[PDB]
Amino acid sequence: KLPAEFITRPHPSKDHGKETCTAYIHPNVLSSLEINPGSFCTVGKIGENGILVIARAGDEEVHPVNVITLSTTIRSVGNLILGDRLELKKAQVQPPYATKVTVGSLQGYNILECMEEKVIQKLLDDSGVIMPGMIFQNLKTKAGDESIDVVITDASD
Amino acid sequence: KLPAEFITRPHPSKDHGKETCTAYIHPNVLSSLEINPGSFCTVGKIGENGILVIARAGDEEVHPVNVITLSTTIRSVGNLILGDRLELKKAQVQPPYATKVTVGSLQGYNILECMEEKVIQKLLDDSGVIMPGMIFQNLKTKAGDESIDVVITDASDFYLSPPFIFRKGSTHITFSKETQANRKYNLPEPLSYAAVGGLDKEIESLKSAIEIPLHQPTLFSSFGVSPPRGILLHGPPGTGKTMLLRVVANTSNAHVLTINGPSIVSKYLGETEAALRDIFNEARKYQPSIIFIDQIDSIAPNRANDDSGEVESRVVATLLTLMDGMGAAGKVVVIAATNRPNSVDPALRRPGRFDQEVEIGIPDVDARFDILTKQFSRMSSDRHVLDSEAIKYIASKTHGYVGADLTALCRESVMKTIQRGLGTDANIDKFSLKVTLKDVESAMVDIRPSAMRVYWSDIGGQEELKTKMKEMIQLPLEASETFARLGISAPKGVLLYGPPGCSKTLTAKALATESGINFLAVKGPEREIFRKARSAAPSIIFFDQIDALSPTSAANHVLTSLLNEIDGVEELKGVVIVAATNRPDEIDAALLRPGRLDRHIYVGPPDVNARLEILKKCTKKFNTEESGVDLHELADRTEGYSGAEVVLLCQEAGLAAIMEDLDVAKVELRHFEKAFKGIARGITPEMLSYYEEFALRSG
Amino acid sequence: KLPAEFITRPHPSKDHGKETCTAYIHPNVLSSLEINPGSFCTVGKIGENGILVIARAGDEEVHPVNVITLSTTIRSVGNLILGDRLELKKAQVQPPYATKVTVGSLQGYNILECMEEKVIQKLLDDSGVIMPGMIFQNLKTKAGDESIDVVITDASDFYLSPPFIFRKGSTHITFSKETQANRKYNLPEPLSYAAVGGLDKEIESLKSAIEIPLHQPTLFSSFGVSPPRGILLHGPPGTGKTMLLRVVANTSNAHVLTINGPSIVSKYLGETEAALRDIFNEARKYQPSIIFIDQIDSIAPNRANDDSGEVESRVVATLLTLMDGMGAAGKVVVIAATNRPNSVDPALRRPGRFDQEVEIGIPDVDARFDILTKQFSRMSSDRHVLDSEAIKYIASKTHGYVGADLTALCRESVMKTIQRGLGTDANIDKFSLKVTLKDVESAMVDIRPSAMREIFLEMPKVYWSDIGGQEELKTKMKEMIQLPLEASETFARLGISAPKGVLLYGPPGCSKTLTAKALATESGINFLAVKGPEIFNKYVGESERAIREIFRKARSAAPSIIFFDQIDALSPDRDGSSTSAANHVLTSLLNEIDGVEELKGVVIVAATNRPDEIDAALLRPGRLDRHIYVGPPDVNARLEILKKCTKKFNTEESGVDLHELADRTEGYSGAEVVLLCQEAGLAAIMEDLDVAKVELRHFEKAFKGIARGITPEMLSYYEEFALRSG
Ligand SMILES: Nc1ncnc2c1ncn2[C@@H]1O[C@H](COP(=O)(O)OP(=O)(O)OP(=O)(O)O)[C@@H](O)[C@H]1O
Numbered sequence A: 001k002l003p004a005e006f007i008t009r010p011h012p013s014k015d016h017g018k019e020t021c022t023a024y025i026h027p028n029v030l031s032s033l034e035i036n037p038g039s040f041c042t043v044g045k046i047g048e049n050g051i052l053v054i055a056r057a058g059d060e061e062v063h064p065v066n067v068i069t070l071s072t073t074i075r076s077v078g079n080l081i082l083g084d085r086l087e088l089k090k091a092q093v094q095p096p097y098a099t100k101v102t103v104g105s106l107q108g109y110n111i112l113e114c115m116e117e118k119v120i121q122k123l124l125d126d127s128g129v130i131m132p133g134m135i136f137q138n139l140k141t142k143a144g145d146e147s148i149d150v151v152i153t154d155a156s157d
Numbered sequence B: 001k002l003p004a005e006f007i008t009r010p011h012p013s014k015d016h017g018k019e020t021c022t023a024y025i026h027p028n029v030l031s032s033l034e035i036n037p038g039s040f041c042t043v044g045k046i047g048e049n050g051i052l053v054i055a056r057a058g059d060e061e062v063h064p065v066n067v068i069t070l071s072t073t074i075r076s077v078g079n080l081i082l083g084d085r086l087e088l089k090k091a092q093v094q095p096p097y098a099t100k101v102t103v104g105s106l107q108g109y110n111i112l113e114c115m116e117e118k119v120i121q122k123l124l125d126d127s128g129v130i131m132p133g134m135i136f137q138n139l140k141t142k143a144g145d146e147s148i149d150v151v152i153t154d155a156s157d158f159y160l161s162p163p164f165i166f167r168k169g170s171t172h173i174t175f176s177k178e179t180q181a182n183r184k185y186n187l188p189e190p191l192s193y194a195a196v197g198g199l200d201k202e203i204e205s206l207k208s209a210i211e212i213p214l215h216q217p218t219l220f221s222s223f224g225v226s227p228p229r230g231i232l233l234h235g236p237p238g239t240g241k242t243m244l245l246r247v248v249a250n251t252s253n254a255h256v257l258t259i260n261g262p263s264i265v266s267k268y269l270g271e272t273e274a275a276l277r278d279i280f281n282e283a284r285k286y287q288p289s290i291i292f293i294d295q296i297d298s299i300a301p302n303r304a305n306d307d308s309g310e311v312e313s314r315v316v317a318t319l320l321t322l323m324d325g326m327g328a329a330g331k332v333v334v335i336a337a338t339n340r341p342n343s344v345d346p347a348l349r350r351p352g353r354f355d356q357e358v359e360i361g362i363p364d365v366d367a368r369f370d371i372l373t374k375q376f377s378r379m380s381s382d383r384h385v386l387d388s389e390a391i392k393y394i395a396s397k398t399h400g401y402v403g404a405d406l407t408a409l410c411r412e413s414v415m416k417t418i419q420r421g422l423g424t425d426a427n428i429d430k431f432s433l434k435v436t437l438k439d440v441e442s443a444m445v446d447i448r449p450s451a452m453r454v455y456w457s458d459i460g461g462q463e464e465l466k467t468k469m470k471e472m473i474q475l476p477l478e479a480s481e482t483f484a485r486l487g488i489s490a491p492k493g494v495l496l497y498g499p500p501g502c503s504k505t506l507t508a509k510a511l512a513t514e515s516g517i518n519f520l521a522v523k524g525p526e527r528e529i530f531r532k533a534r535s536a537a538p539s540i541i542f543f544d545q546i547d548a549l550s551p552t553s554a555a556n557h558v559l560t561s562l563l564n565e566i567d568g569v570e571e572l573k574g575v576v577i578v579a580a581t582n583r584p585d586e587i588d589a590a591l592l593r594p595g596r597l598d599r600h601i602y603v604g605p606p607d608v609n610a611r612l613e614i615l616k617k618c619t620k621k622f623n624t625e626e627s628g629v630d631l632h633e634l635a636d637r638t639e640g641y642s643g644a645e646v647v648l649l650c651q652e653a654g655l656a657a658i659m660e661d662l663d664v665a666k667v668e669l670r671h672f673e674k675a676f677k678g679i680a681r682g683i684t685p686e687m688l689s690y691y692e693e694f695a696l697r698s699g
Numbered sequence C: 001k002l003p004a005e006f007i008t009r010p011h012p013s014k015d016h017g018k019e020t021c022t023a024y025i026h027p028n029v030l031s032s033l034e035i036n037p038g039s040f041c042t043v044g045k046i047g048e049n050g051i052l053v054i055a056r057a058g059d060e061e062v063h064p065v066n067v068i069t070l071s072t073t074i075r076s077v078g079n080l081i082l083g084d085r086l087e088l089k090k091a092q093v094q095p096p097y098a099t100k101v102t103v104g105s106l107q108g109y110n111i112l113e114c115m116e117e118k119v120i121q122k123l124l125d126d127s128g129v130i131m132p133g134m135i136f137q138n139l140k141t142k143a144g145d146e147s148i149d150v151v152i153t154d155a156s157d158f159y160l161s162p163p164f165i166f167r168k169g170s171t172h173i174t175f176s177k178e179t180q181a182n183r184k185y186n187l188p189e190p191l192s193y194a195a196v197g198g199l200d201k202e203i204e205s206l207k208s209a210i211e212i213p214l215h216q217p218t219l220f221s222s223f224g225v226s227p228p229r230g231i232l233l234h235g236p237p238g239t240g241k242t243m244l245l246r247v248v249a250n251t252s253n254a255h256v257l258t259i260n261g262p263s264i265v266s267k268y269l270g271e272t273e274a275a276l277r278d279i280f281n282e283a284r285k286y287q288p289s290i291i292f293i294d295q296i297d298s299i300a301p302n303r304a305n306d307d308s309g310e311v312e313s314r315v316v317a318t319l320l321t322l323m324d325g326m327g328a329a330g331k332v333v334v335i336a337a338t339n340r341p342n343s344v345d346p347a348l349r350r351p352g353r354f355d356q357e358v359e360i361g362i363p364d365v366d367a368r369f370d371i372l373t374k375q376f377s378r379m380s381s382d383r384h385v386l387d388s389e390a391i392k393y394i395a396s397k398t399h400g401y402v403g404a405d406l407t408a409l410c411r412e413s414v415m416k417t418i419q420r421g422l423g424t425d426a427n428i429d430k431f432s433l434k435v436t437l438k439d440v441e442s443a444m445v446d447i448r449p450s451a452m453r454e455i456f457l458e459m460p461k462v463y464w465s466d467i468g469g470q471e472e473l474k475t476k477m478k479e480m481i482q483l484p485l486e487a488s489e490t491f492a493r494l495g496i497s498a499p500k501g502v503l504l505y506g507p508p509g510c511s512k513t514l515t516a517k518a519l520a521t522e523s524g525i526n527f528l529a530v531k532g533p534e535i536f537n538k539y540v541g542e543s544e545r546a547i548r549e550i551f552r553k554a555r556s557a558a559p560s561i562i563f564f565d566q567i568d569a570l571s572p573d574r575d576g577s578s579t580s581a582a583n584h585v586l587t588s589l590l591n592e593i594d595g596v597e598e599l600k601g602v603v604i605v606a607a608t609n610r611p612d613e614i615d616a617a618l619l620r621p622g623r624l625d626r627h628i629y630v631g632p633p634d635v636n637a638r639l640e641i642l643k644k645c646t647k648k649f650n651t652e653e654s655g656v657d658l659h660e661l662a663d664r665t666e667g668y669s670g671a672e673v674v675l676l677c678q679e680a681g682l683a684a685i686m687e688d689l690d691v692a693k694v695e696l697r698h699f700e701k702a703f704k705g706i707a708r709g710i711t712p713e714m715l716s717y718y719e720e721f722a723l724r725s726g
């Protein structure tokens, strides 16, 4: 086969459990890449730096080998628009544990009615891989506003 | 994988002692090349030489597989610049122990604070393996708070030099002043500003252009987007582009890449996009990176022509998109070298991409003198005579040409001197040979200037017009305060009308020689050339013919229509302007108004002095004592013939001699008489009378 | 492992006999070849067979595996060249015994002071066997004689020469014959500097320039200037550069490690460069005296062309950046020989090691008879004619013949001799046959060499007697052609700058083309007819390439002269604004004609009928120096033309004086006279079949056939154009 190119694609569902750090890769190409499911792989546009993400088994048949599935978050890290070229690398480095992080949502006034725990539970499902570019939806129950979002700023470590 | 390509990168943390003779190769690559961590390996540019440094495990795996970290000291030994190709060879020869080594100092300080109780140990703790380079920058060694450099020049007891491991007691330490490494190994020497020519303004502009983004890119990124990155070098070929880019790469510690361009693109394959993307990704991998482009015009010619190429369009598009996507806050600069500015693609030469334009001007006599003195100082001058006056005379005698293959003149002069000395002294040693100047002059005459493909003694001048020409070239220029305060427009030259065979060409050549500035004649029947007059500024512009364009025909009409714009440009900076004509009556009436052509000067046959000078110059090829000519009777006989028929006379006499006695040793009076009888009264009196009438009616 | 090819190396130690027939084969290679040191190993060229050499231990590990050793001077017998690939074979058969051996010394006068006590035992104590042809440096011989050598002429009792067995007292040894060995062995012969004549002037400059670096180059050690490591030999095709390279390689008696290849590349991306890197590393380590790089243009052309810069760009860049090593001390001289001078990369010619740019021209004028005599002596000293006058005459004839053409002429003369001998003596032995001038002339007629090839058309024969015209034009043309063509040192020393260009303008039918044909026939002895519109091509870039090729590649220094039939059809572009084929070809011609002043005496000639279109960005002071009016023939010229055309007729029988006819035809020219004579002859043939005479009535009848003649309007136009030109 020799697949030298990859294309980003969105998940059919919102995937509430695993918005971030989810990249579906076909088992055939993954096996040929000598990459285990529990191994980090960096993906990014050709000619630019890659973004590491854990390898995931493909959704059985009727799944194209070329495409890689992401959900609204990994693409937004490098402003990756659907259909852009992608490159895969097997080089992974263990990152240090995060500490003293700060989060601040754009287009929103500083308010403390988020209860400060509902957003925390979303980060638990991330299971690592923290980067300054993250876009979420924070569900509901926030001042009765449907069109709101939360973005992480950076980490002080 | 089989990695056949490797690059270099300085190690962080500023390691001391252990930094030398270490190559942190990737463990996967180290095991693949069947070389143990505790072994000696050859690291260096492919096919050139080796350095024999000890390989390393590589510590963590965060470092890229292809790159291997090497210290700056080892790289400077073989002039291993950043990004140079590297090759690993498994075979190794055991290095013998060093004995009776010698060490020197790069700086002029010698025999000062010779402690040697840690310096000697320094040569031992650094994993041994002493190379001729040993560029030391670790620790803080000083004598009165001043940095010094120590170089182990020689160590005598297919690589750059045989490897020797320093030992504490098996060798003796001797200190002396050498300022350079030993020449036996013939190691490459990094280029410095002392060796290169002066080019003060050009080198200063290039240094500023390179320095401005290099040290403060964050401020540019914060202030705005798209900082200047592209640097374009153009001008006349041979002035020096590869040498100066090599110099600025050597003096910088940032990553550099060699991009010729024909090798980057694969013919009939269209892989130039991928190649350029990979090159720019590699450049972006390291924050300090320099991009060098050679012959960018050939790679990407003008898109207007239909023969530019689909591959040219593809490479232009990929270059544009990569420059768009390279980012703003990055510390990246692109250097592009081109032959001619015209061949540069118009889209590339647009604001926001290559605004910082650097051009190399044509060297003058002062620049030639400076570069000659620099080359003579660089060359071993134990015997060569300094002779500032001789160098100045040689520079002045040489025709104005760009600094192309000037070292070739010295090389051929050396060859001629060697050839003379061998015959003179029957294969004697070079120290007994002597170097003269006649061989240099002969070589300079033989090689001739190659810029294009006259002297005041060669071409005379009339004294009547000397005062007027001196006034026109001095009063408007030397003393402009009077004109500025009185609001008086410059004379803007005069109109010269004369027969084609008169001294008008001789007068123009005399003016050009007296000005001392090289110029290109503009033919009559022949915008871009006129625009270059302002860009250069101090020069002379002469028009061979203006009569044709005064009233091909289309070219003449274009020239006389664009003369209106010429006058407007020439109004701001008149400097000096001259022209020649054959039919004065065809000139425009509006062109004779005051403020444009203040005066009109008639030119005729050359005077007695100019005729005698021309006769002497044309007879110089022949002989005078054997011929018996007094160089004055011929002038008296042919005073009124023309200002150029003497060349025809000499050619006819030479042809007659070479067909009457084959090889010639002297020229008899018979050939001169035959030449004189061949052509008689070339000029006409009626047209000279018409010129006199025009001069009288002009005023 | 598995070394397919091996390279020989001379023994560093010098010793008579001991070094002969010794091969220090590596023990690993010797063991892997299943051959013991007590067995003979075959060593020879890749295309040739091996030779009988006994194996040796290999002197431990001082000699690398890939390199072997051989005798220093025995290789000269087979013309073996250092650094070339060798073959090793295991099959070997014991040769039989030989007797009545014969040997010949290099010196002409043999049979002197032959003690025979040492010479006989040398062939037994050298650990070798007798081979047809023997070379050895030896030492001082006898008394009052320098170092001399003896060559085994013959040894009579799928290999280059049959091996034998030699002993001391069981066979008789005699010496006779000459230096040259028997040709029945098919062995090659050594090539020396004497084997080449004529070029020698170029050779003197090249031997000096190559030699200072190859000998003691310590003079430029402390100078630090760029080191000279090349000559950049080039010239016209067939000039004989390969034989000069072979001579300089053989006479250097040193390593000649090099390879040419037909633009050899590799499919692997890295191997195509690693091969060259390994070759250069070996050259640095093995220090060959001369390295040969042939056909640089084929392997590294100019980067201006799009397809030319592929692959070779990185190769030439690495070669340039690598050849700048081992400065001062160190020869490592590389020789670059190419056919096309301007096709080489300008960046390659930029460095100063090719500043000399020695170019060898085709033989001409002098030394041609010398090289012909040398080649005749080399082929056979007997059974051939040796006349100085005949050789001088054949050298003067066909001035455009290159040395390769001379060799082809000699071969065709031998073929003609063979054919004549067979046809005369009914397949007799050809040993007694002798060469004469008739076969040489027949060969010269029938060869049609490559000098005139690629054209397939030749100008018709013409002589000075066949044309009678104004003596002034002929004298001026002879002065223009013969003076610069005969020699150039007088022009160079005296500074005379010949125009090297003449424009022939005049009324039609004035025989300017015929004058050019006669000029080419007389002095040039070579014609290169080029047509203006012919060089035009449908493709935009093909016309420029074609004109550049016809201007440069086909140009020969003394032989070739280019003649333009109608130069007025190129410069005028009519209503052409920009991007026109005519404008492009005019610009190319101007660029390729403004950079030449003397060069090689091209002395171009052009003819035209309408000069008014010539003055379109073409008329320049370097080309308008010489103007020829080329006027109509006068009464004397017309009378001469009438006499020449009437020679076939019977003037005495007819009684015509051929004077009043010329007087009546005052406004006519040569073409009209020829036409009227032809019409009169045709009428005479028609009226009464063959009569072999012409009467006055025929001329009267043919007079009305001529249509007026040269009208005064074009004559006045030509006169005013000449006055304007001045
Ligand atoms: N300003 C200078 N000072 C000293 N030497 C110079 C200078 N300019 C040129 N040279 C000499 O002339 C050589 C030619 O310059 P270089 O090799 O850089 O070529 P280039 O002019 O960039 O190339 P091209 O012929 O393609 O225009 C240099 O290698 C150097 O030896």
Ligand SMILES: Nc1ncnc2c1ncn2[C@@H]1O[C@H](COP(=O)(O)OP(=O)(O)OP(=O)(O)O)[C@@H](O)[C@H]1O
Residues within 6 Å of the ligand: C195, C196, C197, C198, C199, C200, C236, C237, C238, C239, C240, C241, C242, C243, C244, C338, C339, C371, C375, C403, C404, C407
């Ligand atoms: N000095 C000489 N004396 C005799 N023959 C010579 C001499 N110089 C050259 N020749 C002749 O030139 C020919 C040598 O041909 P060679 O193999 O050198 O190729 P070439 O045609 O010259 O090559 P190229 O076109 O590549 O330069 C032979 O016919 C040889 O006789």
Ligand SMILES: Nc1ncnc2c1ncn2[C@@H]1O[C@H](COP(=O)(O)OP(=O)(O)OP(=O)(O)O)[C@@H](O)[C@H]1O
Residues within 6 Å of the ligand: C466, C467, C468, C469, C507, C508, C509, C510, C511, C512, C513, C514, C607, C608, C609, C633, C637, C641, C669, C670, C671, C672, C674
């Ligand atoms: N002096 C002469 N002797 C013999 N034949 C002559 C002489 N002058 C002219 N002729 C004849 O007249 C012809 C005129 O020359 P040619 O036909 O080559 O044309 P041309 O004068 O060069 O003109 P065009 O410019 O049309 O080519 C000659 O070929 C020849 O047949």
